[PDB]
A paper describes a structure:
One of the unexpected findings of the first structures of [name] was the discovery that the domains of the enzymatic dimer are flexibly linked, allowing an interdomain motion from an “open” ligand-free conformation to a “closed” catalytically-active structure.
Analysis of electron density distribution at the enzyme's active site reveals density in omit maps consistent with bound 5-FU. Comparison of the architectures of BAU-bound and 5-FU bound monomers of [name] reveals that substantial structural changes are restricted to a single loop region toward the back side of the active site. These chemical groups are all absent from the 5-FU-bound structure, eliminating every interdomain protein-ligand interaction. In spite of the lack of these stabilizing associations, all of these residues adopt conformations similar to those observed in the BAU-bound structure.
Author numbering:
A (entry chain B), B (entry chain A): 16 to 308
Write the structure that this text describes.
């Protein structure tokens, strides 16, 4: 019903397209036959988390056959990993705007060549909370910049280009509904601030560099909280400004690993942090199951 | 002689430090005993490229003993891989400014706790060339922004903070020296433009998004060429801005994978691309064997 579209008049004249970072080529691969049935894409930082995600949702849908694995569709490259089970695609994206950008440029063309339509895309990951207990799942209402505005800036040919961040409201609602049914963890809906640096960029005091005080930070965070911000991470803004523009329905679901009003160090036991990081997976695999039933 | 320093008062007050992304902590690890003897750090995108590097410099230094390999010091995470042979450290950094910044904050802190001094740090990578044949090695004179200036801008508590990019001039001459001795491939010195996006960020026409034309790309790449730029990549600017400020001598050495005046697609056969990628490694590992002879 709603096809994945590119916003680029230069693609039609190309004889082939090398998705360099995926190690996939329009000449070597039957894209419509490989990926044409994709309806749900889950993305996150880590290749192992994304394979775990693909195993878990394969089980949830019961396409989980005994023994056998989900091959890395991008095995051979080491930039991104990719997995698939029925209409679900799993894709790692590393850390930061540039890393997910490259993945998203290539994934969106991949889906376009595959002539995919009605695609829901969900980012799962981790974040720092503002005024939330650690381990809280935040469903992102708006992906915002460091002014707390629903905007994404990039430089194109030396000029600053402002594009809007848009996450699907209906999708936000569906995921919230799912979480109240599950009732396995605190879930909130808030704005998510995207940064280009984890230390000075997130107002941390424990970096190799720090140009400000404990109270400069505290007052920036409180300002953020007042403007609707509930968490902080590194990939939401570019994700929200590309997916919508290309006809994907996008959501972001992150767990908080700490409350940033109370500290900076991520000091919880490994096991606790591990339990926290299952939570976006749990919510999103359950949501996919509920949508495909 | 010259110690690795931090530009952060809050670090001495701290009782313990968790290097979250390395899975290293002061409370579990002996930093001087682990890393005190490190004099050279080589950084690059991929874990497997950085393992191949430690093996190569190991061989070069004659510390290549029969059979055994190099344990990943950061095993148990998948953010960054890290390897050591004698006084050389090898650390991967993934893709983009944010990925390498996180690595750099925690790496500099790691060198500090280890009481390291006289540390030379080199980035080896890949890049798109401007007016150079594919496979040319570029030693970066200045890491520049998208207006061709030796500055790195980040946002700190909502505010634009501009720092200078500084790459060691003597180090550039030393690397060039080694290249003239080796005489195994074309080596140029020039400026490197760091970008936040591989497609539109670098004036490519083949992204999922493109508002401009061939003529626009061409004029922007020419303007860059006239301002000293010979190659384009994604990590040099934050690298150049952080390393020197913290008392490390920094260099960037990238091979070009294509000539951007001629195209955007990376269509060289895989084996050709591999040969190209061994080149910065060849030069840097030889530089290191030379400094330690
Ligand atoms: O970008 C972030 N990711 C995860 C965190 F815990 C955090 O504080 N910031
Ligand atoms: O950032 C880049 N790395 C490698 C390339 F070939 C290129 O064009 N751009």
């Amino acid at each position: 019903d709603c096809p994945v579209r590119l916003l680029n008049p230069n693609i039609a004249k190309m004889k082939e397209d090398i998705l360099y970072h995926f190690n996939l080529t329009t000449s070597r691969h039957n894209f419509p036959a490989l990926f044409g049935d994709v309806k749900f894409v889950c993305v996150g930082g880590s290749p192992s988390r994304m394979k775990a995600f693909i195993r878990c949702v394969g089980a949830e849908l019961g396409l989980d056959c005994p023994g056998r694995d989900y091959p890395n569709i991008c095995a051979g490259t080491d930039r991104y990993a990719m997995y698939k089970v029925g209409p679900v695609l799993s894709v790692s994206h590393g850390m930061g705007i540039p890393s997910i950008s490259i993945m998203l440029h290539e994934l969106i063309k991949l889906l376009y060549y595959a002539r995919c339509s009605n695609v829901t895309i969900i980012r799962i990951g981790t974040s720092g909370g503002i005024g939330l207990e650690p381990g809280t799942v935040v469903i992102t209402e708006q992906a915002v910049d460091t002014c707390f505005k629903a905007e994404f800036e990039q430089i194109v040919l030396g000029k600053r280009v402002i594009r809007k961040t848009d996450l699907n409201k209906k999708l936000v609602q569906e995921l919230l509904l799912c979480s109240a049914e599950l009732s396995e963890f605190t879930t909130v809906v808030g704005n998510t601030m995207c940064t280009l640096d984890f230390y000075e960029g997130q107002g941390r005091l424990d970096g190799a560099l720090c140009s400000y005080t404990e109270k400069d930070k505290q007052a920036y965070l409180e300002a953020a909280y007042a403007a609707g911000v509930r968490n902080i991470e590194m990939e939401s803004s570019v994700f929200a400004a590309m997916c919508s523009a290309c006809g994907l329905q996008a959501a972001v679901v992150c767990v908080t690993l700490l409350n940033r009003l109370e500290g900076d160090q991520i000091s919880s036991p490994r096991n606790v942090l591990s339990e926290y990081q299952q939570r976006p997976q749990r919510l999103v695999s359950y949501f996919i199951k509920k949508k495909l039933s």
